[PDB]
Each structure stands twice: as structure tokens, then as C-alpha cells.
Amino acid sequence: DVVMTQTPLSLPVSLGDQASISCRSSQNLVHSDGKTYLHWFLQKPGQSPTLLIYKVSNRFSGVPDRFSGSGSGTDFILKISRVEAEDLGVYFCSQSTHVPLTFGCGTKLELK
């Protein structure tokens, strides 16, 4: 299948910091239909995952603009503008261009 790689594993940050999470795919995620089915989910401490950004750069309803996704082919990146306590949790990248649908193992954003 398609292996999703996230770096780093743990990311200590201070409130107000700027940050970027990288996600690399083992295969090109551009679907034959011309769409890139790369997504980002946030799992706050003790919660269930939540859709953050869909199809590389589209923010889901209720998602602040401090979140921006970019990337293409196999390299993608999530940028957080001004880290706030509510951003703490585990970020996972996910692809649905290929079956099986696969996920990365997450990046833990920690208050340093």
C-alpha cells in the first residue's frame, strides 16, 4: 500500500510559535481524475480525530486560517501560524487516492 511518513514524531512548541509538519507518501497521490486526495486530521488530547484540511489545502468548516496545507506529488506540509493551546494534540496525514486508504502515525504537538 501507500506508506505515509510524518516528521517529526514529537514537536515541542511555545504558544505563539510558527510550525510546519511534513508528510511524505510512498507513492504519488495525484489521482487519475486529477485530484490529490491528501488530508490532515487533528486528534486533541482525549478526543477523536477531526478533519482539519482536505485535499491538500482546503480548510474544513470551523478550521482557523492559522492552518495551511501545501505540497504536491509525494511531499506535503501543514503550517500552523500562531500556536495556541487548542492546537495541542496529534496531527495525522491521510490519503484516499489509493486503496487501502492509509494514514501516517501522527505528529505530537507538545507545549515546551
Added chain:
Amino acid sequence: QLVESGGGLVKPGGSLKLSCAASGFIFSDNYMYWVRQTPEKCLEWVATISDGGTYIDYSDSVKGRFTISRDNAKNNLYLQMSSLRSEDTGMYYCGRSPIYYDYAPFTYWGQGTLVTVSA
């Protein structure tokens, strides 16, 4: 509103049937999913069923052993699990994605139900 139930501790080779009750949305216009998070925190897609149950798909490691259905007792999604391996331990969540819009699979998630295959 998605609530999963049915999870527990079983032994390898066991069977378990998970349930996900829906509420607050139309159900018949949502693809349903089962996703599990391993003790390592990794997320693994388990299965998918379209609105109407006309199409279903599973992860290979699960094919034949697991069985998904959105039967109707009252807005329910099911996952019958058999031949349980230790590799199946994790928190199972059901999730959904609206049919009319194109966002991301598993647009919404439930609270989770843990299943531990051991001893």
C-alpha cells in the same frame, strides 16, 4: 452523533460484533466507515460501506474475516469480527462522509470502542 459499542477483551480466534448508532444527521446520505487506532497511535482504515449498502470495501488484512453492514434496527452500522488476532487490538471508531459534497473520507468520527485481543 456517532456512538460505538460492543468492544471488549476477547482471545485470539474470537468473534465480536461492534455497533455504531447514528443520530443528528440523515444517515442514508452518508458513507460509513470503521477505522482503528493501534496502541502506537497509528490510524488504520478497516472498511467502508456506501449509503444504500450497494458498495463495500475492506483492508486486505481484514477481508473475509470482518463483515460490515449498515443494517436497520434503527440507524445502525455494524462490524462483525471473527478470527480475531492480537494485531486487531485498538480503539475502533465509526465515521461518516456526506455523499453530496467531496471533502475527505471519515469527515466525522464517533467516540471510539476499544477491543483487546489477548491471553
